[PDB]
Design an enzyme around this catalytic site. Structure first.
Site, PDB file in Angstrom:
ATOM      1  N   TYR A  40       0.843  -1.189   0.000  1.00  0.00           N
ATOM      2  CA  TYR A  40       0.000   0.000   0.000  1.00  0.00           C
ATOM      3  C   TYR A  40       0.874   1.232   0.000  1.00  0.00           C
ATOM      4  O   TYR A  40       2.095   1.123   0.091  1.00  0.00           O
ATOM      5  CB  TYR A  40      -0.965  -0.017   1.189  1.00  0.00           C
ATOM      6  CG  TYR A  40      -1.865  -1.232   1.168  1.00  0.00           C
ATOM      7  CD1 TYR A  40      -3.079  -1.209   0.505  1.00  0.00           C
ATOM      8  CD2 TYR A  40      -1.478  -2.415   1.781  1.00  0.00           C
ATOM      9  CE1 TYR A  40      -3.892  -2.325   0.465  1.00  0.00           C
ATOM     10  CE2 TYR A  40      -2.280  -3.533   1.747  1.00  0.00           C
ATOM     11  CZ  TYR A  40      -3.487  -3.487   1.089  1.00  0.00           C
ATOM     12  OH  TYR A  40      -4.290  -4.608   1.057  1.00  0.00           O
ATOM     13  N   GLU A  87      -2.487   3.922   8.290  1.00  0.00           N
ATOM     14  CA  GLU A  87      -2.573   4.886   9.380  1.00  0.00           C
ATOM     15  C   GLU A  87      -2.591   4.274  10.783  1.00  0.00           C
ATOM     16  O   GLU A  87      -3.364   4.716  11.627  1.00  0.00           O
ATOM     17  CB  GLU A  87      -3.858   5.701   9.187  1.00  0.00           C
ATOM     18  CG  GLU A  87      -5.186   4.906   9.416  1.00  0.00           C
ATOM     19  CD  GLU A  87      -5.778   4.251   8.144  1.00  0.00           C
ATOM     20  OE1 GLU A  87      -5.046   4.040   7.149  1.00  0.00           O
ATOM     21  OE2 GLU A  87      -6.994   3.941   8.145  1.00  0.00           O
ATOM     22  N   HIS A 116      -2.417  12.409   4.012  1.00  0.00           N
ATOM     23  CA  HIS A 116      -3.493  11.425   4.064  1.00  0.00           C
ATOM     24  C   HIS A 116      -3.477  10.608   5.355  1.00  0.00           C
ATOM     25  O   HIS A 116      -4.435  10.619   6.097  1.00  0.00           O
ATOM     26  CB  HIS A 116      -3.451  10.490   2.850  1.00  0.00           C
ATOM     27  CG  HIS A 116      -4.649   9.594   2.762  1.00  0.00           C
ATOM     28  ND1 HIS A 116      -5.794   9.948   2.087  1.00  0.00           N
ATOM     29  CD2 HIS A 116      -4.897   8.381   3.314  1.00  0.00           C
ATOM     30  CE1 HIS A 116      -6.695   8.984   2.210  1.00  0.00           C
ATOM     31  NE2 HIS A 116      -6.174   8.024   2.954  1.00  0.00           N
ATOM     32  N   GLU A 117      -2.388   9.894   5.624  1.00  0.00           N
ATOM     33  CA  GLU A 117      -2.316   9.078   6.832  1.00  0.00           C
ATOM     34  C   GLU A 117      -2.458   9.952   8.072  1.00  0.00           C
ATOM     35  O   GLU A 117      -3.022   9.531   9.076  1.00  0.00           O
ATOM     36  CB  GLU A 117      -0.981   8.343   6.923  1.00  0.00           C
ATOM     37  CG  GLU A 117      -0.570   7.591   5.661  1.00  0.00           C
ATOM     38  CD  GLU A 117      -1.595   6.580   5.228  1.00  0.00           C
ATOM     39  OE1 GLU A 117      -1.556   6.174   4.047  1.00  0.00           O
ATOM     40  OE2 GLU A 117      -2.451   6.200   6.061  1.00  0.00           O
ATOM     41  N   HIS A 129      -6.088  10.712   8.916  1.00  0.00           N
ATOM     42  CA  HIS A 129      -6.718   9.542   9.534  1.00  0.00           C
ATOM     43  C   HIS A 129      -6.693   9.618  11.059  1.00  0.00           C
ATOM     44  O   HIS A 129      -7.576   9.072  11.747  1.00  0.00           O
ATOM     45  CB  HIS A 129      -6.037   8.247   9.092  1.00  0.00           C
ATOM     46  CG  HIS A 129      -6.643   7.639   7.874  1.00  0.00           C
ATOM     47  ND1 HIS A 129      -7.986   7.352   7.783  1.00  0.00           N
ATOM     48  CD2 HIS A 129      -6.084   7.241   6.700  1.00  0.00           C
ATOM     49  CE1 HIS A 129      -8.237   6.825   6.592  1.00  0.00           C
ATOM     50  NE2 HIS A 129      -7.102   6.749   5.922  1.00  0.00           N
ATOM     51  N   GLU A 139     -12.681   6.934   4.796  1.00  0.00           N
ATOM     52  CA  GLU A 139     -11.872   7.371   3.654  1.00  0.00           C
ATOM     53  C   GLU A 139     -12.347   8.667   2.982  1.00  0.00           C
ATOM     54  O   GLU A 139     -11.532   9.435   2.490  1.00  0.00           O
ATOM     55  CB  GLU A 139     -11.731   6.253   2.618  1.00  0.00           C
ATOM     56  CG  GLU A 139     -10.983   5.011   3.129  1.00  0.00           C
ATOM     57  CD  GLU A 139      -9.544   5.294   3.555  1.00  0.00           C
ATOM     58  OE1 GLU A 139      -8.989   6.358   3.190  1.00  0.00           O
ATOM     59  OE2 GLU A 139      -8.954   4.441   4.249  1.00  0.00           O
ATOM     60  N   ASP A 146     -13.207  -6.643   1.270  1.00  0.00           N
ATOM     61  CA  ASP A 146     -12.293  -6.248   0.199  1.00  0.00           C
ATOM     62  C   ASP A 146     -13.071  -5.914  -1.065  1.00  0.00           C
ATOM     63  O   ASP A 146     -12.810  -4.910  -1.719  1.00  0.00           O
ATOM     64  CB  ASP A 146     -11.306  -7.379  -0.126  1.00  0.00           C
ATOM     65  CG  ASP A 146     -10.070  -7.372   0.764  1.00  0.00           C
ATOM     66  OD1 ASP A 146      -9.720  -6.302   1.307  1.00  0.00           O
ATOM     67  OD2 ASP A 146      -9.436  -8.444   0.906  1.00  0.00           O
ATOM     68  N   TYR A 168     -13.567   6.839  -1.267  1.00  0.00           N
ATOM     69  CA  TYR A 168     -12.616   7.941  -1.223  1.00  0.00           C
ATOM     70  C   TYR A 168     -13.191   9.169  -1.916  1.00  0.00           C
ATOM     71  O   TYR A 168     -13.322  10.235  -1.318  1.00  0.00           O
ATOM     72  CB  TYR A 168     -11.307   7.531  -1.921  1.00  0.00           C
ATOM     73  CG  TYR A 168     -10.539   6.431  -1.208  1.00  0.00           C
ATOM     74  CD1 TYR A 168     -10.861   5.085  -1.392  1.00  0.00           C
ATOM     75  CD2 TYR A 168      -9.477   6.741  -0.369  1.00  0.00           C
ATOM     76  CE1 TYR A 168     -10.152   4.074  -0.728  1.00  0.00           C
ATOM     77  CE2 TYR A 168      -8.760   5.743   0.296  1.00  0.00           C
ATOM     78  CZ  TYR A 168      -9.099   4.422   0.115  1.00  0.00           C
ATOM     79  OH  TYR A 168      -8.376   3.445   0.768  1.00  0.00           O
TER      80      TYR A 168
HETATM   81  C1  LIG Z   1      -5.392   6.842  -0.617  1.00  0.00           C
HETATM   82  C2  LIG Z   1      -3.871   6.917  -0.731  1.00  0.00           C
HETATM   83  C3  LIG Z   1      -3.355   8.279  -0.280  1.00  0.00           C
HETATM   84  C4  LIG Z   1      -3.184   5.810   0.057  1.00  0.00           C
HETATM   85  C5  LIG Z   1      -3.976   4.508   0.061  1.00  0.00           C
HETATM   86  N1  LIG Z   1      -4.080   4.185   1.469  1.00  0.00           N
HETATM   87  C6  LIG Z   1      -5.088   4.429   2.297  1.00  0.00           C
HETATM   88  O1  LIG Z   1      -6.166   4.970   2.041  1.00  0.00           O
HETATM   89  C7  LIG Z   1      -4.774   3.921   3.664  1.00  0.00           C
HETATM   90  O2  LIG Z   1      -4.993   4.965   4.624  1.00  0.00           O
HETATM   91  C8  LIG Z   1      -5.622   2.661   3.881  1.00  0.00           C
HETATM   92  N2  LIG Z   1      -5.413   2.112   5.205  1.00  0.00           N
HETATM   93  C9  LIG Z   1      -5.287   1.614   2.817  1.00  0.00           C
HETATM   94  C10 LIG Z   1      -6.230   0.437   2.930  1.00  0.00           C
HETATM   95  C11 LIG Z   1      -7.597   0.659   3.056  1.00  0.00           C
HETATM   96  C12 LIG Z   1      -8.468  -0.419   3.166  1.00  0.00           C
HETATM   97  C13 LIG Z   1      -7.976  -1.720   3.157  1.00  0.00           C
HETATM   98  C14 LIG Z   1      -6.608  -1.941   3.039  1.00  0.00           C
HETATM   99  C15 LIG Z   1      -5.734  -0.863   2.926  1.00  0.00           C
HETATM  100  C16 LIG Z   1      -3.141   3.427  -0.563  1.00  0.00           C
HETATM  101  O3  LIG Z   1      -3.285   3.174  -1.780  1.00  0.00           O
HETATM  102  O4  LIG Z   1      -2.328   2.808   0.169  1.00  0.00           O
HETATM  103 ZN   LIG Z   2      -6.893   6.198   3.961  1.00  0.00          ZN
END
Ligand SMILES: CC(C)C[C@H](NC(=O)[C@@H](O)[C@H](N)Cc1ccccc1)C(=O)O
Ligand SMILES: [Zn+2]
Ligand SMILES: [Cl-]
Ligand SMILES: [Cl-]
Ligand SMILES: [Cl-]
Ligand SMILES: [Cl-]
Length: 625
Positions: free
Chosen positions: A266, A270, A294-295, A298, A317, A375, A383
């Site tokens: 990823y 966060e 972003h993180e 969160h 998100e 998933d 988002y």
């Molecule tokens: C949106 C981007 C700035 C980054 C994106 N990551 C996120 O949104 C993280 O905060 C999420 N925790 C990534 C995630 C969400 C749901 C299930 C598994 C992994 C990523 O692609 O890793």
């Molecule tokens: Zn996120």
């Protein structure tokens, strides 16, 4: 005070029940969780015990039901005494329910379960000595959305939040999603703000650390440590202070970043007090740090205030993307915020266009059953449709100044709690009594429950216009200029001198879209203008071809593929053996397979076992396996 059809969809009691857990979490309060673990690189297992302080809430069974997935549960004790328990057979996709008989005398009781992870664990990736750049073994977790139950038995729902303590024994350094109790091979931590299991984070390996701000430290492999420090040290405290002004004081103490091994799939995760980050964030110029905004956001939307179930994932998100864009807007100005939203708009479009079952999976609020893998509902929709609903609300309610009081009220009201969309709406309505007519004009039905793109806002396009113009110009000149000499007379390095990496990414994107205006209706191909595509790469070599930004480098490779420059296929193949981030790996393999399958499958077979289990899984089937 909200509208009827909403009223109609709302459950009789909130927060709405989480259908993705097998646990009976509504029946207990989790007052505290202690993890007592040992990491074995030899066996690639984490073992030990979890202790919960619980309270029965009030024909009771009476049984404890916990979530597990591929765990070896060894013993269970309640109040020091052995307790009868039975694991149920696995049911997909939610796992194996652990059933415990609690003959405990009192409403308040202690529950201890000894367990170990197994080879089928879906929560961890293990690397051995030969796989890491730095020469030692390494392991890290990723629990979102429902993999925490594959790391320890628990009430694996975002509706349940608990303080944690943790002791972790390892022959190598350990970081954890909590504050270290300071100094050994036994690492102790405390998370004093209650958190859901999916936010638990652990990593262990040859880690060193360096300060990147007054309350921030970066952790990573020694070889990369100073590069990481430089990338973050100029900006992280500024991001924190910016977020705090928009919302309110950050209450988690430290804000640290773990820059993970190259197989990390990823962009970031966060985990409280330890953001997990992809090393592809390091570009040596500080281009990619918004992933950190972003993180960081969160910390409020997700960590402090959490979605009650994966049906309402947009609350996490969508808010985060909204808040992230407020941070960058406050630092860089509205054109920057709007540019980010414009890229997000095209990401949303692509995600919905590429969708399996858009009628189902493109609605903002989801309807997962106990038969649906959470998933399967993750896409760009929560988002960006989430962000767009909030941006719409910001607008119609009178702008940032009018909305920010609500934002503060919202995050204060639900601090340390979990909630559903319906509670979000009640709060919005209670907060704006004078604006009831404006809120009643919002088509809540379309935004929350209807599939497809929402209505398109009017984004400031200033920082994209130059980009769009050039891509158009390139598309046109490709059909007019013949020799490289011709191209150098029309084009030069000068024209992208002012393009940031995002603009370069958008530019290279627009080119494979063959322009941002229907002058040439047909999706003709760059393959037939090799002099132009080769001239492109030449004239722009400094900023595109020589870029150390994985985002631009990826686009460069993709343009090269769309142009079928065969002599470059080798570099794509080898580069793909250097990164593990899904966003590059998955598309990269799709790209390489469409120009040289004999090379794409050869490459995968070469690197398949270096990728995270998840990324290996998805690339496997992308390549028809
Ligand atoms: C949106 C981007 C700035 C980054 C994106 N990551 C996120 O949104 C993280 O905060 C999420 N925790 C990534 C995630 C969400 C749901 C299930 C598994 C992994 C990523 O692609 O890793
Ligand atoms: Zn996120
Ligand atoms: Cl009411
Ligand atoms: Cl309604
Ligand atoms: Cl036990
Ligand atoms: Cl009001």
């Amino acid at each position: 005070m909200l509208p009827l059809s909403i009223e109609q969809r709302r459950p009789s009691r909130s927060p709405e029940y989480d259908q993705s857990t097998l646990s009976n979490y509504k029946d207990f309060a989790v007052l505290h969780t202690d993890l007592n673990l040992s990491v074995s690189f030899e066996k690639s297992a984490i073992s030990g015990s979890v202790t919960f302080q619980l309270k029965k809430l009030h024909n009771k069974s009476d049984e404890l039901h916990l979530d597990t997935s591929y765990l070896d549960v060894q013993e269970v004790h309640i109040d020091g005494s052995k307790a009868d328990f039975q694991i149920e057979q696995r049911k997909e996709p939610l796992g194996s329910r652990l059933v415990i008989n609690n003959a405990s005398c009192n409403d308040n009781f202690t529950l201890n379960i000894q367990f170990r992870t197994t080879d089928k664990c879906t929560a961890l990736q293990w690397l051995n000595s030969k796989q890491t750049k730095g020469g030692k073994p390494y392991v890290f977790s990723q629990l979102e959305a429902i993999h925490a139950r594959s790391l320890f038995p628990c009430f694996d729902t975002p509706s349940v939040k608990s303080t944690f303590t943790a002791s972790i024994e390892s022959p190598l350094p350990v970081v954890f999603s909590g504050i270290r109790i300071e100094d050994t091979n036994i690492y102790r931590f405390e998370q004093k703000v209650p958190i859901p299991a999916y936010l638990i984070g652990i990593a262990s390996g040859d880690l060193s650390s360096a300060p990147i701000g007054p309350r921030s430290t970066v952790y990573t492999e020694p070889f990369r440590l100073k590069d990481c420090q430089w990338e973050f040290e100029n900006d992280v405290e500024k991001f924190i202070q910016t977020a705090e002004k928009i919302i309110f004081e950050y209450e988690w103490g430290t804000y640290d970043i773990l820059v993970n091994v190259d197989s990390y799939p990823y962009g970031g995760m966060e985990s409280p007090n330890m953001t997990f980050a992809t090393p592809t964030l390091l570009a040596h110029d500080r281009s990619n740090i918004d992933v950190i905004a972003h993180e960081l956001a969160h910390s409020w939307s997700g960590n402090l205030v959490t979605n009650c179930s994966w049906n309402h994932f947009w609350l996490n998100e969508g808010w985060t993307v909204y808040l992230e864009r407020r941070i960058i807007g406050a630092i860089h100005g509205e054109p920057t915020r709007h540019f980010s939203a414009l890229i997000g708009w095209s990401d949303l479009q692509n995600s919905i266009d590429s969708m399996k079952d858009p009628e189902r999976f493109s609605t903002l609020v989801q309807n997962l059953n106990d038969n649906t893998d959470p998933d399967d509902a993750f896409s760009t929709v929560p988002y960006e449709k989430g962000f767009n609903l909030l941006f719409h609300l910001e607008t119609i309610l009178g702008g940032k100044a009018e909305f920010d009081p609500f934002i503060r009220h919202y995050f204060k009201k639900f601090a340390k709690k979990s909630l559903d969309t319906f509670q979000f709406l009640d709060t919005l309505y209670e907060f704006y009594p004078e604006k009831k007519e404006i809120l009643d004009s919002v088509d809540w039905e379309t935004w929350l429950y209807k599939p497809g793109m929402p209505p398109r806002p009017h984004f400031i396009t200033a920082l994209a216009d130059n980009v769009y113009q050039l891509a158009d110009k390139w598309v046109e000149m490709a059909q007019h200029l013949k020799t490289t000499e011709d191209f150098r007379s029309e084009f030069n390095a000068i024209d992208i001198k002012d393009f940031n990496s995002n603009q370069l990414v958008l530019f290279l994107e627009t080119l494979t879209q063959n322009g941002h205006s229907n002058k040439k209706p047909k999706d003709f191909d760059w393959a037939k203008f090799p002099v132009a595509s080769r001239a492109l790469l030449d004239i722009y070599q400094d900023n595109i071809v020589k870029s150390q930004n994985a985002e631009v480098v990826f686009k460069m490779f993709k343009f090269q593929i769309f142009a079928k420059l065969q002599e470059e296929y080798k570099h794509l193949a080898d580069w793909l053996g250097t990164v593990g981030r899904m966003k590059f790996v998955r598309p990269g393999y799709r790209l390489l397979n469409s120009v040289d399958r004999r090379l794409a499958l050869a490459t995968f077979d070469k690197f398949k076992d270096t990728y995270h289990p998840i990324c290996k899984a998805l690339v496997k089937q992308d390549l028809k396996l």
